[PDB]
Enzyme design. Sequence first.
Site, PDB file in Angstrom:
ATOM      1  N   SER B 151       0.810  -1.228   0.000  1.00 58.81           N
ATOM      2  CA  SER B 151       0.000   0.000   0.000  1.00 58.81           C
ATOM      3  C   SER B 151       0.875   1.326   0.000  1.00 58.81           C
ATOM      4  O   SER B 151       1.854   1.334  -0.751  1.00 58.81           O
ATOM      5  CB  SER B 151      -1.157  -0.161   1.028  1.00 58.81           C
ATOM      6  OG  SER B 151      -0.768  -0.539   2.337  1.00 58.81           O
ATOM      7  N   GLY B 152       0.606   2.431   0.718  1.00 58.14           N
ATOM      8  CA  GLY B 152      -0.624   2.808   1.387  1.00 58.14           C
ATOM      9  C   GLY B 152      -0.633   2.370   2.827  1.00 58.14           C
ATOM     10  O   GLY B 152      -1.427   2.877   3.622  1.00 58.14           O
ATOM     11  N   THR B 156       6.156   4.539   4.707  1.00 55.93           N
ATOM     12  CA  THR B 156       6.912   5.752   4.915  1.00 55.93           C
ATOM     13  C   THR B 156       6.700   6.248   6.331  1.00 55.93           C
ATOM     14  O   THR B 156       7.660   6.661   6.961  1.00 55.93           O
ATOM     15  CB  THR B 156       6.513   6.840   3.912  1.00 55.93           C
ATOM     16  OG1 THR B 156       6.676   6.367   2.566  1.00 55.93           O
ATOM     17  CG2 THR B 156       7.366   8.063   4.111  1.00 55.93           C
ATOM     18  N   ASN B 197      -4.404  -0.789  -5.349  1.00 53.41           N
ATOM     19  CA  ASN B 197      -4.435   0.333  -4.448  1.00 53.41           C
ATOM     20  C   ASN B 197      -4.682   1.591  -5.217  1.00 53.41           C
ATOM     21  O   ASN B 197      -4.303   1.724  -6.362  1.00 53.41           O
ATOM     22  CB  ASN B 197      -3.103   0.397  -3.694  1.00 53.41           C
ATOM     23  CG  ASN B 197      -3.146   1.325  -2.493  1.00 53.41           C
ATOM     24  OD1 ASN B 197      -4.019   2.154  -2.371  1.00 53.41           O
ATOM     25  ND2 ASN B 197      -2.202   1.189  -1.591  1.00 53.41           N
ATOM     26  N   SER B 200      -0.161   3.859  -5.020  1.00 52.28           N
ATOM     27  CA  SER B 200       0.871   2.831  -5.027  1.00 52.28           C
ATOM     28  C   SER B 200       2.116   3.403  -5.654  1.00 52.28           C
ATOM     29  O   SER B 200       2.044   4.129  -6.670  1.00 52.28           O
ATOM     30  CB  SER B 200       0.484   1.622  -5.895  1.00 52.28           C
ATOM     31  OG  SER B 200       1.556   0.704  -6.000  1.00 52.28           O
ATOM     32  N   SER B 201       3.293   3.083  -5.075  1.00 55.46           N
ATOM     33  CA  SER B 201       4.509   3.662  -5.570  1.00 55.46           C
ATOM     34  C   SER B 201       5.032   2.845  -6.717  1.00 55.46           C
ATOM     35  O   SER B 201       5.254   1.619  -6.616  1.00 55.46           O
ATOM     36  CB  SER B 201       5.580   3.894  -4.488  1.00 55.46           C
ATOM     37  OG  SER B 201       5.939   2.694  -3.907  1.00 55.46           O
ATOM     38  N   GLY B 422       5.932  -3.968  -4.039  1.00 56.56           N
ATOM     39  CA  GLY B 422       6.320  -5.362  -3.802  1.00 56.56           C
ATOM     40  C   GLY B 422       6.000  -6.140  -5.045  1.00 56.56           C
ATOM     41  O   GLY B 422       5.574  -5.557  -6.060  1.00 56.56           O
ATOM     42  N   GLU B 424       3.942  -7.999  -7.559  1.00 59.04           N
ATOM     43  CA  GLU B 424       2.531  -7.739  -7.846  1.00 59.04           C
ATOM     44  C   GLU B 424       1.909  -8.926  -8.538  1.00 59.04           C
ATOM     45  O   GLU B 424       2.610  -9.698  -9.196  1.00 59.04           O
ATOM     46  CB  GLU B 424       2.295  -6.414  -8.660  1.00 59.04           C
ATOM     47  CG  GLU B 424       2.736  -5.175  -7.893  1.00 59.04           C
ATOM     48  CD  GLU B 424       2.330  -3.893  -8.580  1.00 59.04           C
ATOM     49  OE1 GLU B 424       2.084  -3.908  -9.811  1.00 59.04           O
ATOM     50  OE2 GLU B 424       2.278  -2.851  -7.886  1.00 59.04           O
TER      51      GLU B 424
END
Lengths: 374, 737
Positions: B151-152, B156, B197, B200-201, B422, B424
């Site tokens: 996530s989310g 961080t 999400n 998402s990064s 991560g 996916e």
Amino acid sequence: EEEIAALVIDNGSGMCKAGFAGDDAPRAVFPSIVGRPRHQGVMVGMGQKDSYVGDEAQSKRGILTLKYPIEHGIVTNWDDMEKIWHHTFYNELRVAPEEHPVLLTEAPLNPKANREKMTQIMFETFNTPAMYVAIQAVLSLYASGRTTGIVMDSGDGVTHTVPIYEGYALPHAILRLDLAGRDLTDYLMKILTERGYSFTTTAEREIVRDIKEKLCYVALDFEQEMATAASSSSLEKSYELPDGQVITIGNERFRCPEALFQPSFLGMESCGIHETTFNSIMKCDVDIRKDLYANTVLSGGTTMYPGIADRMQKEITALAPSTMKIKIIAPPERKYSVWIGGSILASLSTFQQMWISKQEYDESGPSIVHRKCF
Amino acid sequence: WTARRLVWVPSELHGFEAAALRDEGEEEAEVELAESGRRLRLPRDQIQRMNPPKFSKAEDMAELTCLNEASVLHNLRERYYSGLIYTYSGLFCVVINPYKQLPIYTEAIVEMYRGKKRHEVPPHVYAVTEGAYRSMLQDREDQSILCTGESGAGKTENTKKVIQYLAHVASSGELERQLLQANPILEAFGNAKTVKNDNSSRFGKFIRINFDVAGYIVGANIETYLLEKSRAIRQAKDECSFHIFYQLLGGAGEQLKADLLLEPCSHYRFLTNGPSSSPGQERELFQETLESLRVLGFSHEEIISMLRMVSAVLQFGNIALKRERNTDQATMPDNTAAQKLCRLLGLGVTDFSRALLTPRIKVGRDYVQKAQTKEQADFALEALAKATYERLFRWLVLRLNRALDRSPRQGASFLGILDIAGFEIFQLNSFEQLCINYTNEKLQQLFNHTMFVLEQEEYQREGIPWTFLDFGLDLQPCIDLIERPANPPGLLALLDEECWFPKATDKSFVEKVAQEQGGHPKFQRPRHLRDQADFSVLHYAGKVDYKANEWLMKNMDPLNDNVAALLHQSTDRLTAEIWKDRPRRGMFRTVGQLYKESLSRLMATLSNTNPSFVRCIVPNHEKRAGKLEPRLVLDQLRCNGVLEGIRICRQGFPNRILFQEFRQRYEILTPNAIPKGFMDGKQACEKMIQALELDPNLYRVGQSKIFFRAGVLAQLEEERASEQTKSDYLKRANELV
Ligand SMILES: Nc1ncnc2c1ncn2[C@@H]1O[C@H](COP(=O)(O)OP(=O)(O)O)[C@@H](O)[C@H]1O
Ligand SMILES: [Mg+2]
């Protein structure tokens, strides 16, 4: 699902006509050809694809040498046939044959080995619950929706003739004549050569097949039409080759199908098709003939030529007693008659018990084809 | 507990629930479920052993004598309901976000953690990061912290807490509070709304905290390795592109829109799936983001410039190339769009028009034009879009690190913190999905290697010589499958080959890879009926299916050097400064190739250092605690490699117990073996293991400990509960009679 549907495949030489049982037309119909790259390719990131099957081959014709795996209703090369079937199921229909019973067509008087080996494949190549192998002519008779008739079956493979009365069937009376669309094609490319056009290779052999499939027609009297070839007007037709060359074919057009009625042209003694029909009918009991004369059904690709019905009518009537009227029933959509017949047969409820079951085969072996089915 | 054999069962409300084996036979075991109490049949392989209550709520999952996903899931679930977020699984540090705000992260706790081993205290981040910090001052070598995509999750946010620890330990002006401010920036540019999400990064974030030899903060910088730049051009069916695009669209008023000449979503070709609302009202978020930039100290001018190029990337869509009757080259009959572009940059329309359509190339030393197809020029447009975006992003990171201030530089060492998405899995799984998987592959491999060296050195510390294969090697054939250029060539390589070769179709690609590389055991062609996806591979996580559609198009990123040169000559400061550029650069250059290169840089950087590992899981969609969805946790355990970690340690001797503990605790087991008390505590274990009849394969003799397999202590514990049953009976009977 209920009934599971069923699968139907017509393989006389030339075309595979396949689709789901229970439908009025087949989904996939494509030429039964296995083309192989004869010329060694030089690039990188080609194919390689050892060979091409179905109308793929038609598309990429020039490179390939094409080999028809079926000749005269006999499979010459089995792996090729297997490849064609593979293509039908996976490439077109997208079915797992495990999930469907499959019906195959097959020609009369045909070697045992083909039926037996055919079944051997269907069970031990494409795992399948059940299958049946059926005579081509009967199927077309069903498709025509008549119980009685003498079915004149000529595909590209071979020509066949099976009289039927009120269902039943007459083994002694069944006739099989070695002429076909393919033999007409071979004749036709021969006859072109007298005009200058020379077609020496499998690729363009199919081009002449295409020409025949439209330009050729059957004379309502051969000699009259050949006489009128003197003053060439309508009998010539321009044809466009894929090369861009133009061909112009006169009398040569209609004498091509004439061969069916005059196999002396081809050099065979075997009587013409109309005489073979007489040969069949004459073998039958005196009683039933009346309706066979009146119920002649034409099937298969190589009855498609315009005017064949009329010529057959004129010849049969000429030969036979004019005491009884000779109707010939030749539907349009005849080309697909076998496949339609297959569709209707697998759709029939009672038929659903006559299948050759996988189980039965596993116990009793491949030889059981003849034991159970005709 | 009775000897019913309570054994964990597969089920589809709880991922794994407890059930009593009792009746067995072949695969089918009729089993009493603890809860319902109904008896049903399932295959026995499916059903995984349970650890005794002594193991319940273990600190470290490596300690469990039964290692399987069921046991893992139970332990974690137990902890989580108990309120305990942190657990250690093998080398991993597993955190599960409660979504509540927990009293944790005070000063007493952090002080309490200091200078201790991880086992010494309860599981916590502060512990693993303490491990890193201590290993740095101790080992004087750099350290890295890997957080796996979740996530989310507030990964961080957690990492802010890590920094908080770092500050309190290292002393001697608050922490970099702008690190909080950085999130929305990179979030806005970097992240997109996706099926998994809404935020998402895509890009990886590497946060470097720089430390002097004294152990104090010299400063910090951010580094951003992988980006998915292909996301900007191209997108999933039901997903959105990066946040900044949308927040720009709705967010900017006429004041800014009029400068940028932004339009609604329907106007742009490069924006897929329409507006795709999404709001959220938006616009407010954009407003927040502008302030977020401003406090950081970028000028309004600079912001406007940035936003202008963000328009520019989108503008690359409005250009239409029209194929011309007969000729190849194509052209651009409508000047309006590219005119707009030219306003938005330094480019002269004519210059750009010639350059794009018919570029010139240096065939040394004398230039010559080129003919370009419509398709080729389209790819060039998309390339400059994508490369432009990437360049922009890079500049933001550098300009940001300038907005971060450091004391005296170059001193001495750093701690990297990696935040990346991560492993996916979607239903469809396109190309980007494959690249992500590839990277997660390598990261996972590094973890395996790390674990490997840890165990190998642990053996020596206990004096046991044992040789065993590199754990990293498990992943290696899969990696070669995707990567390996040469002898048999890889999926990426083969894709590239497909892309360049003349008339390439997606179908020719899959066929080619089957023919070229199908003999590979990790590669699987589904065949037959669908099986919608056209080929599949077998990762650590499991079997994933890939759809090959439009892969060639996604792969193409040919870049015109001529247009690039024009950018390098741009009038405006911003873009020209950006384009301030070896490989195959020009034409060729594929996204797969660049991505691979970028990952290679990252793997080198991480590989230089000593990594440490944290795994984040979300319990639920609810955004609330007290609800753990076992299926979701299973899924996460798959993609973070934790399952792989358990299947790794099982191959070795996961359970390690000291002599002293083993004797004092388990002495009840074997009154016969255990003598009158020679003591020294080695002889004890010698006797115990000897009479208990255990294979020498299943243990080793170490200096301070004995190393055990999985399930050996399960048997011994059963002999302690059997022994305890015998003793309970003898005691109770004796008291009674
Ligand atoms: N439209 C047509 N007009 C004339 N002849 C045709 C036409 N279509 C096919 N043919 C001839 O008939 C042959 C096809 O026969 P087909 O029905 O496929 O036989 P089978 O069913 O036994 O395979 C072709 O090879 C060609 O010679
Ligand atoms: Mg036929």
